Ligand binder design. Structure first.
Ligand SMILES: *[C@@H]1O[C@H](CO)[C@@H](O[C@@H]2O[C@H](CO)[C@@H](O)[C@H](O)[C@H]2NC(C)=O)[C@H](O)[C@H]1NC(C)=O
Ligand SMILES: *[C@@H]1O[C@H](CO)[C@@H](O)[C@H](O)[C@H]1NC(C)=O
Lengths: 221, 213
């Protein structure tokens, strides 16, 4: 049915000398090896280690110590990457990957953030704006707007679905704006009048929510 | 004693920049340090926030790609491989990486990547289009919705009886039709008079919710 890898939560924030466990739920596996790549701004992405699920064996690539990075097994046939003794230089996006023939398939990645400053995680506070009559009158279409505010860290994932479909809709997303301990992001969905009667669901994920998305229903009623 | 191939995998991608939708992307990857003719080389798309995606790859006997509009090719006397993507759209933006498969030959093989090169796809120019402007409210939050303008440069301002309100901020994004739309957010009491004022190509557009006659 096609190989696919899932990674949650979308970010992990830590102070120095702590550790971090990254999750990879691999579905329809076609291979025995789970690969862990790291991406950092301005550097070439590179593989850190490869893990054999069967032999339950974690093999680091040169430059990486098994004391520093190590993969093991988790609940529900999940591969997990532990990064010990975190330093700021460890921040970046960590992707699990799997070979599927001559093609390598990658998870979406979890962002590891290591900082030397005190921090507190803060969940998005959503604010919804609904289509206005004037917009429908002038454009025969209506825009749903969700503003997420005052979250930390500056990592968030949002998507719109309509009931009966499972492909995210083509929404517009603004940049993540802010600084210090408070970031925000607005997204919005412009749809034709026919779709204005259908039911929509809005989702977001954030590290302060753990793994489970928050979901809102938008309906006629 | 151990026996290993004497090689380093050096890959340098070029050709990135800002492209107009509909144009053809042509990238080059200059390789060095390993035996070129017998190698296996691929192109991967790393778009921030998405899964890295295989696009196409090749060796001396075969090539494949994810879509018809995507192809790759080789220049042997120069140790280069190329990427071509016709009919670029907004989804093709991201960081394009050349990759080499390295290892024993099995599922323990790794990809070695270069630094990549950044591609930004933007809408193709078309006739100037003035936006429409809509005010929307939820409690003490006011959104100013600005729909379908081209080109992207504009100036927005939310004001309550003439003075700038606090905590204004502007988000702008392309749409599928090749135009832009934008949302300007601010904070103001649900009963205050509010005006959203947009300047675009020297024309002024606005909506206001009055508090008095
Ligand atoms: C969206 O969901 C709502 C319920 O959340 C649907 O409203 C129901 O509509 C049926 C008729 O099809 C009524 O018999 C129910 O009493 C309604 N329930 C509520 C709570 O209002 C609505 O029909 C859905 N919209 C679509 C397009 O399916
Ligand atoms: C080229 O790649 C194809 C597809 O992965 C593979 O089957 C073939 O053996 C490769 N040829 C060489 C010479 O490596």
């Amino acid at each position: 049915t096609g190989v696919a890898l899932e990674q949650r939560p979308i970010s992990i924030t830590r102070n120095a000398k702590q550790s971090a466990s990254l999750n990879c739920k691999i579905l329809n596996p076609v291979s025995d090896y789970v690969h862990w790549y790291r991406s950092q701004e301005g550097r070439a992405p590179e593989r850190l280690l490869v893990y054999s699920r069967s032999k339950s064996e974690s093999v680091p690539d040169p430059g990486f110590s098994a004391d520093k990075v190590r993969a093991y097994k988790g609940k529900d046939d999940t591969c997990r990457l532990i990064v010990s003794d975190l330093q700021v230089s460890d921040s970046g996006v960590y992707h699990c990957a799997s070979w599927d023939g001559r093609v390598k398939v990658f998870g979406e990645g979890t962002r590891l953030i290591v900082t030397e400053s005190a921090f507190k995680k803060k969940p998005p506070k959503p604010i919804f704006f609904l289509p206005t009559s004037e917009e429908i009158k002038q454009k025969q279409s209506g825009t749903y707007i969700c503003l997420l505010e005052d979250f930390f860290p500056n990592v968030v994932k949002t998507y719109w679905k309509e009931d009966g479909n499972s492909q995210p809709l083509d929404a517009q997303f603004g940049p993540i704006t802010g600084g210090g301990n408070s970031y925000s992001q607005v997204s919005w969905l412009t749809v034709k009048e026919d779709v204005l009667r259908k039911n929509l669901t809005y989702f977001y994920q954030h590290e302060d929510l753990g793994m489970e998305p928050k979901a809102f229903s938008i309906s006629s009623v | 004693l151990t026996v290993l191939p004497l090689e380093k995998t050096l890959l340098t991608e070029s050709g990135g920049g800002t492209y107009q939708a509909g144009k053809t992307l042509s990238l080059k990857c200059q390789t060095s340090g390993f035996q070129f003719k017998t190698s296996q080389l691929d192109w991967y798309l790393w778009t921030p926030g998405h899964a890295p995606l295989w696009l196409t790859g090749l060796n001396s006997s075969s090539t494949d790609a994810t879509e018809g509009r995507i192809t790759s090719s080789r220049e042997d006397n120069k140790n280069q491989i190329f990427l071509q993507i016709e009919d670029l759209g907004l989804r093709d933006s991201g960081q394009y990486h050349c990759a080499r498969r390295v290892g024993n030959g099995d599922d323990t093989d790794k990809l070695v990547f270069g630094l990549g090169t950044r591609v930004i796809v933007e809408p193709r120019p078309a006739a100037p289009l003035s936006p429409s402007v809509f005010l929307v409210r939820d409690q003490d939050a006011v959104a100013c919705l600005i729909r379908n303008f081209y080109p992207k440069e504009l100036h927005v301002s939310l004001t309550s009886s003439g003075t700038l309100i606090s905590a204004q901020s502007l988000s702008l994004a392309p749409t599928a039709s090749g135009t832009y739309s934008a949302i300007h957010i601010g904070r103001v009491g649900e009963n205050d008079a509010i005006t959203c004022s947009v300047k675009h190509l020297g024309k002024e557009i606005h909506m206001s919710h009055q508090a008095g006659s």
